[PDB]
Design a protein around this ligand. Structure first.
Ligand SMILES: [Cl-]
Ligand SMILES: [Cl-]
Lengths: 149, 8, 149, 8
């Protein structure tokens, strides 16, 4: 569980926001892309796994699960690629609530940014620093440090 | 443009 | 010291690799951009500061120190922007050695990637996971967790 | 292309 992340893809402004969630902390990383392709997903996972110790990724849909480019990135970076079936039905609800919260934040910053990619990064920043008590960014560092020790 | 990412 | 990062800009293949180094651990994040503008530098620092608790950034040159776009991102994200004057001459040496190491890694992977951006993320991943004993990715999490406690 | 980022 320190190594487990969930991919999540949401839409806004005719564009696609790809999100990775560190499940045990709620910490996120995200990017804006024109469309979700296996190549964009593969590159985003290579980036994530060079930055945090990613052991397992639950893919966001069957096309990224199937995609051989996504499988090649997971092989390269040492990630176990898994499906994202919510065997726990609470998983579904947690992701939907996250997407609605991110979109709310993005609307609160949206007029400070010309481009959507800035607004999304401002929303990642606000989400990860929000104290709910500890922030998501504090929780993920604590979890991983505990694991390393 | 009066934006953080476009000060113009 | 847990919060201090140094920007560093290096060139390859007619393109610019922008790097942020966490000084106490040697951990890095990096991106490829066409050229090093205040807008690209500002966006890169917004990204970094949403992912780690960035307190201080030593800018890589006087143009990004001066840039009002960079100062606006540092204001937005709560970052103290500082100069990168190597009052400790050891600093120039460490950065130069890091650029030569990264370029070495990039040439070791370069044929596995069509685009330079991929090879650079593969080199981030190799750099951060290399045990020298702990890796840089282990050191940065331990340092910051120690700080949070 | 026989590349991680371009399997073609
Ligand atoms: Cl799509
Ligand atoms: Cl340049």
């Amino acid at each position: 569980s320190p190594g487990i992340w969930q991919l999540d893809c949401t839409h806004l402004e005719g564009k696609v926001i790809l999100v990775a969630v560190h499940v045990a902390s709620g910490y996120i990383e995200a990017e804006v892309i024109p469309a979700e392709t296996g190549q964009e997903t593969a590159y985003f996972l290579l980036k994530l796994a060079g930055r945090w110790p990613v052991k397992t990724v639950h893919t966001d849909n069957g096309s990224n699960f199937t995609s051989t480019t996504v499988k090649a990135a997971c092989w390269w970076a040492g990630i176990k690629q898994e499906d994202g079936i919510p065997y726990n039905p609470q998983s579904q609800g947690v992701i939907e609530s996250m997407n609605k919260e991110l979109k709310k934040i993005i609307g609160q910053v949206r007029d400070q940014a010309e481009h959507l990619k800035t607004a999304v990064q401002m929303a990642v920043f606000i989400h990860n620093h929000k104290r709910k008590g500890y922030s998501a960014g504090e929780r993920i560092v604590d979890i991983i440090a505990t694991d390393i020790q | 443009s009066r934006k953080i990412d476009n000060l113009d």
